[PDB]
Amino acid sequence: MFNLNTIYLSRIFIEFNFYFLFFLFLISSIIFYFSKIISIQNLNQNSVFNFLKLANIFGILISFFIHIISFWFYCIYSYNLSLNIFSDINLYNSNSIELLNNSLLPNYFKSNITIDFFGLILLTLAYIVGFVSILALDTRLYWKNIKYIFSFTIFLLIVYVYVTVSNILLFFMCYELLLIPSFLIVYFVSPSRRAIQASLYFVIWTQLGSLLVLIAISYIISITNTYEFNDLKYFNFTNSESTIIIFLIFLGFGFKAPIWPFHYWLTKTHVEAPSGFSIYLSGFLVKTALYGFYKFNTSIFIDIDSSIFIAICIMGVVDSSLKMWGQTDLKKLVAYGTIQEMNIIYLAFCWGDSCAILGGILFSATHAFLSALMFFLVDCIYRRYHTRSLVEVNGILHITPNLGLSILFMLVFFSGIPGTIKFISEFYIFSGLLEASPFICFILMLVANVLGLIGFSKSWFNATFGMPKKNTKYLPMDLSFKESYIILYCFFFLFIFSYFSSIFF
Amino acid sequence: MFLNPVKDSEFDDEVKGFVPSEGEVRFVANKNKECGYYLQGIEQCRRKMVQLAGDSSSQFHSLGFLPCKRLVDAHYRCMTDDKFGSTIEEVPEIGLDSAQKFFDCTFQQLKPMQSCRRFFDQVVRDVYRANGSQLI
Amino acid sequence: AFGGFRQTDNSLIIDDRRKIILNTRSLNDFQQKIYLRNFFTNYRPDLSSYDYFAFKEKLRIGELFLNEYRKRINNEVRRAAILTPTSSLREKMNHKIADQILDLSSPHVRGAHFQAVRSWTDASKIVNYVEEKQTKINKYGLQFPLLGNMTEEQCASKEDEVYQRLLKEMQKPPKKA
Amino acid sequence: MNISYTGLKLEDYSDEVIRKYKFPNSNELERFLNREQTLTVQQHKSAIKLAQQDFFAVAGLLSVGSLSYIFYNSVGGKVIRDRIRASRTKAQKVIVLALAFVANAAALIIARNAITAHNFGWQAA
Amino acid sequence: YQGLNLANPAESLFSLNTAAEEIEDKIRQIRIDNDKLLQRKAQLEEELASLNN
Amino acid sequence: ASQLQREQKLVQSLQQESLQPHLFKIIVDSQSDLVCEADRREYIKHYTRANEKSSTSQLLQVGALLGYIYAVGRYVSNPSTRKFSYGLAALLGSFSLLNPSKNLHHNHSLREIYSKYNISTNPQALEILKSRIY
Amino acid sequence: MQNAYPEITDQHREFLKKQGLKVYEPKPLPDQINPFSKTYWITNAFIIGVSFLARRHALKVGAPRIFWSGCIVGVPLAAIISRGKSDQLDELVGARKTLEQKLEYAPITRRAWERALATNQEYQNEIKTQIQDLQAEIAAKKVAAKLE
Amino acid sequence: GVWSNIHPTDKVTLSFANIGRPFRLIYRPEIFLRDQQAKFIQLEKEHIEKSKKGEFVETTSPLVLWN
């Protein structure tokens, strides 16, 4: 019963949501530039900053709704396309349906849009995490950094082109564009003075991996003059070229997606970055690397043993889990948790295009939401209690019961209770790893889910419980409606996404 | 495709699958990679001839698809390694039926090349199964 | 146009078909393509791009279909456990059901493993099995809403075809022996 | 280019060869030329027009609903909002309650319509 | 909608194959019944011919 | 019996004029050689244009409803609740009375296309239809 | 699908019946449990009405009412879940899905099979009528021969 | 639009993806191929003429070019 109307509606929605975002950004930027001689806030109720905040927030939100609709259309379209290809067995019949483009808006960068489930999951993560982070950064943007209210819109446009393109070069360029806005945010919006050095560490560490990926892309392009991302089927790389490409790709994308030993920059940046931008970084900016690694390694044929890469990922997991205990800083502890989860996700991609990719994608989504939740809780603690250190913070539950309850439920979700996409992703990865290498699976599970979990829980429980006798004149009140509903939405997603259609998982 | 009908079947249509020999698979893959130019040429020339003389009143309407004959013969020779004749008309009786099916797919039904390559490859596979050691 | 990467090995290549001798370090782009890079990277390289996409989808569906067999037999075992008391339960299970449970073990069905390690012959056999099931279904046209899409005219023509086929099958006499 | 009708004579080729390389029916030739063997370009154009109209309706409805909800329920604290709504007239209260819901619901319904293919002619039996 | 429309193709194939096998069994039963009726008619025709002779 | 009744019903439908556009669309879908390609394409265009359902009708209905509520609220002082409710109910009921009829036979393009073929009393059209009934 | 347990004889079944055993048979859902039942929908309507009244009373007396709201909202949701569960072709421990139920998702095969069954029934009826005519002719011949 | 109207591929892809390839191949590939096939065209013409005549030349048989 599938008809061409659904196909064209899917394509039109995907194409036009990008232009909706772009036109919103363009209008907002034109207003901002041409309303004032100097593009800084006027400290009065009639400033354009209020309009810009409104436009950014409710462009992201409306584009997120349209993205939900377009993602559902894509799911139907992909399912029915697979059915059309698979169903017919007659040799004379073949599915050759050709679509003509609309005459209203042009194709951005003269590229035909191609959408995949992983790309749309990444785009949904971008939308939601960007919404949370923009909601967080309101107190940070003041009177000279208001120009960074558009950072998340720029991120959304970059990610949209990144996930809706079938061109290798455009793919790589979109991946590399993410550096400038993130560096500028960390440099100009971070309150702490150590953020200045943290930004440089972030730039250099990420750029080393960017150069590695650039070398790999140069190898692919120079050898294969193609750029369509599908002509690689008709060209085979020799053993030496293939091993060089996989090594470069893995190391370069692991610089971004933190792997052992390349997580020093991540720890520094998470500790010294804005509490609202740490959410976006951990939640989304480390998963574009995973998506790019998946695309490249599934496109290239590799005839090498992945034991070395699996060992690197497992070593990162073990290192982060063991170090969890020794952190009294909640933000650094959450950063180590992010490193652990990202290393597990990266390990999920070490078997080419096997079924491990499904667990990897689900784990990427759950880690995004869980890291957003954890960093937002740390943000609330730091903002109301003027410290994010375990020695200075104690007995949160008895003065701010809602915040303590949020911490406890965050710990329960992090533990991986059944009924959560966290548990589902752990089940996928461990079920595969048990047959792949059962002893390695046992070691990984033991370390991560006992030693790292206990180290993680020690600090959070100590902060939540106790007796806050110190500085009774300065104790805060409670979570606000904004914070409470953000926490509730994170919990709601982590719980209900387990009912998403199992066809794609 | 790669399915054999059941000779003694209780119901009208029953099929049992078979897997071609590795030698046959290698031969077909190599020949397709080497001769893929001819198949794209057949598609482009088919469209070109239809555009040129598709109209009934056209002068060359009575010579339809004859220019494609050279491309088809070249593709057949390339796939069969110049053996078993220099023309599609010289196809052995073992592959004659599949050759007729391919011609019906391409020129009469004007079906997609995705469909008609199946019948052309079936012709090549029939020849290869018949001979075996002659092609390799 | 495709290109190549300069080679460093000092080996000699003897092409008996073309009756020439080359050196690995001296190969140009086309010679590299012809001699190196000519290996296969898929189960059925003989098939076209569209045909191999169909083959890949059928292989994925066939793996899911074998997993479905395992799930169905497990559900039947649960049904047997609930319906039949523990006495005679194993006696009745030591039949077709137990043999099928063992025959649907991990080597034959990929329950939760990342990859079902199948040779190209095994993949071809699985795809052939899926195609046999598809042929049996399409004989009677059971795939219109599920596992297929068709227009109204196609549905009407298929209904008439299935009606004729059923009439002929009914009119056929019983199979002897 | 040597691939042309020039120099070709039906005398040279056999009758079976001519029958094999004979043009199909005029209708078949027209369908192949226009690429309308399965679907017509006009059907594609109609589908595209409906898709664009549906997207515009959905996006406009979502924007209207979101903005109306925000501006109506973003006037102040709970007490202030309750007092403002109490002083609000009957028709003004009705619109404030109904506008956002109707816009969002219409957008969602238009989205559901596309995936739900009810207008299929095979409904029978 | 998820449950009704987006269903596992493997399980759909299994259900349709079960339905096809059941249809084939019913066709076998119909063949047996038709054969029985035809044999009865042939027996009656033979009896009528013998009586006429 | 059953097949004869089915064929007789098909003949009766062919005789009836209100179903001729649908039956000619069935012929068009079958792609029978009798129907010329140009006429087939024209009929497909007109039939698709006539049958397509657009969200514009729903959008304008909701727009009229919202505009009525907004206008009564803003441009009327101390409006009567009973009058407002009656007007709203009347508008909602009137929305239901708008029931366009797809009189495709009345539509002069489709009728002009298929009148020349006159599927009724046409043996080729009957043969085409008999295999395709739904 | 095929029978898994070893077969038993009809004589053995009759022996068990005489002994007094009964054949296990799944029972239809009662009207209260059946989601397609007038009793079920009357219960839903009563739930909705009582929930609205109790919600109004709770608002009056300053008592929580989100639970009555949940009842009202979940009545349609419970109906959706129950109807979907019933419609799905999933065979838990219970009655097996029949050919008609499976064909309800195969409209083409369903209609074709119905037509084929009707034609086969007509064919069998025609053969039976011809058999009766042949028997009548044989009887008439016998009577005529005996009288002659 | 205008800046890219020279080539169907986007400008960034043109700048980076194409490394070392002739601009004759990037733009106007048909003329590039025909120039490359110049002599093969006359060989094919001679083969066709001989085929019309009694002679059949097997050496140049593979040369059946359409672009």
Ligand SMILES: CCCCCCCCCCCCCCCCCC(=O)OC[C@H](COP(=O)([O-])OCC(O)COP(=O)([O-])OC[C@@H](COC(=O)CCCCCCCCCCCCCCCCC)OC(=O)CCCCCCCCCCCCCCCCC)OC(=O)CCCCCCCCCCCCCCCCC
């Ligand atoms: C466009 C793409 C997306 C883009 C992005 C969009 C992003 C937007 C943001 C949001 C994200 C959206 C993502 C997509 C969502 C898709 C959703 C969807 O498709 O919906 C349709 C989807 C399926 O649609 P369908 O298949 O088409 O429907 C037709 C089918 O035929 C229907 O038939 P069916 O059989 O399939 O029905 C399914 C369902 C039908 O629903 C029901 O039947 C309702 C059953 C309710 C049972 C409630 C009680 C259960 C527990 C008690 C049981 C024991 C009782 C005592 C027994 C005593 C015995 C002696 O039934 C069940 O699943 C049964 C599960 C029962 C257990 C549920 C809870 C388990 C525990 C979970 C814990 C997790 C949190 C831990 C927290 C720990 C502390 C921090 O349906 C649902 O969504 C079902 C939701 C069910 C919710 C159940 C209520 C949860 C209760 C939690 C209690 C926890 C208590 C505290 C724990 C301990 C704390 C210490």
Ligand SMILES: CCCCCCCCCCCCCCCCCC(=O)OC[C@H](COP(=O)([O-])OCC[N+](C)(C)C)OC(=O)CCCCCCCCCCCCCCCCC
């Ligand atoms: C060649 C064509 C070029 C087109 C350029 C477009 C020009 C855009 C100019 C924007 C001016 C914004 C200020 C208008 C005056 C607001 C007055 C006011 O506050 O009174 C309340 C009145 C009415 O309030 P209300 O109380 O009736 O609330 C209901 C609101 N509506 C009507 C929208 C349902 O005005 C508004 O509320 C309008 C708010 C406008 C700002 C919206 C911000 C969200 C993001 C969209 C911004 C525009 C970008 C383009 C659209 C998105 C991308 C497709």
Ligand SMILES: CCCCCCCCCCCCCCCCCC(=O)OC[C@H](COP(=O)([O-])OCC[N+](C)(C)C)OC(=O)CCCCCCCCCCCCCCCCC
């Ligand atoms: C981890 C180090 C610290 C972090 C920085 C990361 C730097 C290193 C990044 C990975 C580079 C690749 C290493 C693995 C190579 C595997 C293949 C191989 O060489 O085996 C012999 C290969 C494979 O041979 P084979 O035996 O498998 O098959 C071919 C055999 N013959 C040729 C005989 C037929 O042999 C070769 O062809 C030699 C290739 C050597 C290439 C080495 C230089 C690579 C230069 C590009 C990357 C430079 C990145 C620098 C980044 C900045 C550093 C500060």
Ligand SMILES: CCCCCCCCCCCCCCCC(=O)OC[C@H](COP(=O)(O)O)OC(=O)CCCCCCCCCCCCCCC
């Ligand atoms: C917020 C409403 C959203 C409506 C949904 C569609 C949005 C499409 C993107 C619009 C972006 C802003 C305008 C850009 C103008 C421009 O420079 O646009 C310039 C381009 C022109 O392109 P060309 O020069 O190539 O022709 O505009 C377009 O291509 C089409 C613009 C959109 C056409 C639909 C307009 C719908 C109007 C709805 C009115 C009611 C809205 C109520 C909101 C509360």
